[PDB]
């Protein structure tokens, strides 16, 4: 009964207004690119619309015709059609209304669940914040992976790069980072809440559905936006999805809040851009990518800033995901993005199969912020851990004397300490506890095949018996002398009792 009533509610409010609008005739349509004739006042990279309600962008302004790219399917556009200019640069909805919604590259709800109630729109192609608004990266972005929070820390406003081969665990790191923010978003203070945006570029719809259900299971869609431009979406959409998501995150960082955006991958945005550019007839470049392929990314990753307290104080972290071919980091797009981003997180298949998961290659992984953007407890402990692994990696290729034998023992203990599962990120204090136990010669007695058992049991024991100590470490944010003495006695007791 009420189904038809709510159906009518939609018609009751319509768009009566018909206006006198400028137009153009489609001289030629093919491969997703139209050549409109007319539109004498259409702007550059403006949004136009076709006779069937299908949108497009006027990318080329040639003297005789306008080269338009169609944001959708192309079979429905004929020759001699009509293109009406909307008189507005391409823009997307923004706001907290988008949280928990799966949307396409243009901000249209994709999961049903009604429409988006956004009250504001933002232009995708906005300039990055200047030099003055920013401020050095201060807070830590808690990722939940021990090896990332300890050895290659990420701040808020940094632009890490997750680069590896196919199926080494990049999207897994992204999902762990997204899921971990649940503890902060559930709390009270707004200075720690981090809203997450996941841009899925070129991934088949099944993968994005799996990801969305995984986030829902971990109850992580309360604060996550998913901008999906999947494989079957015309190239002009996969080219624009990163910019739409970055605008949705620019809103947060401009309104004093903190956001995290994860482009996944950028190596597929590059391919979509290449297809667009080749079908507009623009001359190719190296590997057929257009000349403006560095710009494409540099203008996009430069929007992940850390505003100073005069501009709200908000921040927007970025975690672009690149995909190399057989570890050839020396390729074109990988090198561009490596020279664009701050840090890197190298995942290697040789480490993935050797049992080290996440495969993070701590030897090559870097983070310019480093010291800054790390909690004091983690700063204290991960430093000694970093030195110990650095020494271990030198003498590792073989396998006598007591000193070097114990050095290898400690290195191996720490190595098996850094392993982890999927979608089970750890609180920072728990990571500190585990790493402290491992680095203070305690595990040197145990076998290295049992270190996982220890780690797990120790976590389960501490999370219940010694919740107070973990709360102390979190609140005070350092391993004070009394906290260190406690940690010492807890570890000494537990080790023997196991």
């Amino acid at each position: 009964a009420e189904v038809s009533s709510i159906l009518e509610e939609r018609i009751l409010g319509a768009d009566t207004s018909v206006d006198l609008e400028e137009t153009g005739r489609v001289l030629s349509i093919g491969d997703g690119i139209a050549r409109v004739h007319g539109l004498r006042n259409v702007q550059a990279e403006e949004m136009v619309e076709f006779s069937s309600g299908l949108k497009g962008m006027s990318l080329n302004l040639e003297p005789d015709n306008v080269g338009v790219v169609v944001f959708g399917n192309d079979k429905l556009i004929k020759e001699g059609d009509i293109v009406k200019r909307t008189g507005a640069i391409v823009d997307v909805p923004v706001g907290e209304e988008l949280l928990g919604r799966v949307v396409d590259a243009l901000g249209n709800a994709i999961d049903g669940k009604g429409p988006i109630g956004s009250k504001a729109r933002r232009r995708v192609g906005l300039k990055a914040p200047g030099i003055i608004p920013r401020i050095s990266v201060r807070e830590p972005m808690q990722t939940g992976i021990k090896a990332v929070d300890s050895l290659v820390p990420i701040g808020r406003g940094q632009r890490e790069l997750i680069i590896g081969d196919r199926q080494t665990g990049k999207t897994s790191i992204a999902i762990d980072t997204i899921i971990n923010q649940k503890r902060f978003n559930d709390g009270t203070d707004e200075k720690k809440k981090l809203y997450c945006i996941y841009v899925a570029i070129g991934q088949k719809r099944s993968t994005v559905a799996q990801l969305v259900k995984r986030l829902t299971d971990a109850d992580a869609m309360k604060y996550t936006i998913v901008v999906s431009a999947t494989a079957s979406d015309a190239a002009p959409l996969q080219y624009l999805a990163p910019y739409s998501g970055c605008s949705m995150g620019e809103y947060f960082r401009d309104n004093g809040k903190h956001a995290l955006i994860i482009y996944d991958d950028l190596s597929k945005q590059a391919v979509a851009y290449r297809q667009m550019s080749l079908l507009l007839r623009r001359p190719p470049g190296r590997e057929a990518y257009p000349g403006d392929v560095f710009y494409l990314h540099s203008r996009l990753l430069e929007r992940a800033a850390k505003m100073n307290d005069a501009f709200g104080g908000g921040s927007l972290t970025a975690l672009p995901v690149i995909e190399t071919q057989a570890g050839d980091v020396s390729a074109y797009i990988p090198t561009n993005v490596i020279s664009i981003t701050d840090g890197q997180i190298f995942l290697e298949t040789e480490l993935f199969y050797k049992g080290i998961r996440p495969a993070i290659n701590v030897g090559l992984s870097v983070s310019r912020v480093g010291s800054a953007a790390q909690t004091r407890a983690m700063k204290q402990v991960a430093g000694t851990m970093k030195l110990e692994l650095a020494q271990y990696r030198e003498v590792a290729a073989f396998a006598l004397d007591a000193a070097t034998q114990q050095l290898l023992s400690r290195g191996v203990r720490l190595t098996e300490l850094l392993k982890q599962g999927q979608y089970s990120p750890m609180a920072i204090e728990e990571q500190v506890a585990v790493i402290y136990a491992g680095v203070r010669g305690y595990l040197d007695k145990l076998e290295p095949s049992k270190i996982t058992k220890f780690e797990n049991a120790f976590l389960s024991h501490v999370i219940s018996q010694h919740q107070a100590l973990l709360s102390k470490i979190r609140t005070d944010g350092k391993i004070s002398e009394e906290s260190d003495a406690k940690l010492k006695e807890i570890v000494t007791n537990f080790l023997a009792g196991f």
């Binding site: 939609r10 018609i11 018909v18 006198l20 400028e22 005789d64």
Partner: protein, 188 residues
């Protein structure tokens, strides 16, 4: 270079460049109407099956083609502008797109004398009184002195209403688009 006077509507391509050259040449010395009439004349002169067959064969030397065209132009007593234009098109081998040049100059001269092509599309034909009020209102759209050039096609694909094109301006009071709009908004 000589500061050519630009045409009102920019036509582009090979025909565009030749026609813009002709228009700039004629606009100075003020021979636009006569040269347009001569262009319309050559539109038929070259179309003659014998001449067309003798000018579309690329194995008659350009010399012979230029000589024949000079003879025709002399036999027709043309302006030096049109004779030189035909000679230039013949030397450059651009005769196969001469009708394109005439069409371009026609489009370029129509705008010169202030005309804005118009199109009206409806499911069925119209009664002449309604067409008269359409003429009046559309002339209301135009500016001062801008004659109108109405064209009334009949498209039954649309379910009714009206569609009007005036230059690049477009107004769609057609049943089909409004059905589409309601169906889509209601579907959301």
């Amino acid at each position: 270079f000589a500061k050519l006077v630009r045409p009102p509507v920019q036509i582009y391509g090979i025909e565009g460049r030749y026609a813009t050259a002709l228009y700039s040449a004629a606009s100075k010395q003020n021979k636009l109407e006569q040269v347009e009439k001569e262009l319309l004349r050559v539109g038929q002169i070259l179309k003659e099956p014998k001449m067309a067959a003798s000018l579309l064969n690329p194995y008659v030397k350009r010399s012979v083609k230029v000589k024949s065209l000079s003879d025709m132009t002399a036999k027709e007593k043309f302006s030096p502008l049109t004779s030189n234009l035909i000679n230039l098109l013949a030397e450059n081998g651009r005769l196969t797109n001469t009708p394109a040049v005439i069409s371009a100059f026609s489009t370029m001269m129509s705008v010169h004398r202030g005309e804005v092509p118009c199109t009206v599309t409806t499911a069925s034909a119209l009664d002449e009184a309604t067409l008269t009020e359409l003429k009046t209102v559309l002339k209301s759209f135009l500016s001062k002195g801008q004659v109108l050039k109405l064209e009334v096609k009949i498209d039954p694909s649309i379910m009714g209403g009206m569609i009007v094109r005036i230059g690049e301006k477009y107004v769609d009071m057609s049943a089909k688009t409004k059905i589409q709009k309601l169906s889509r908004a209601m579907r959301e």
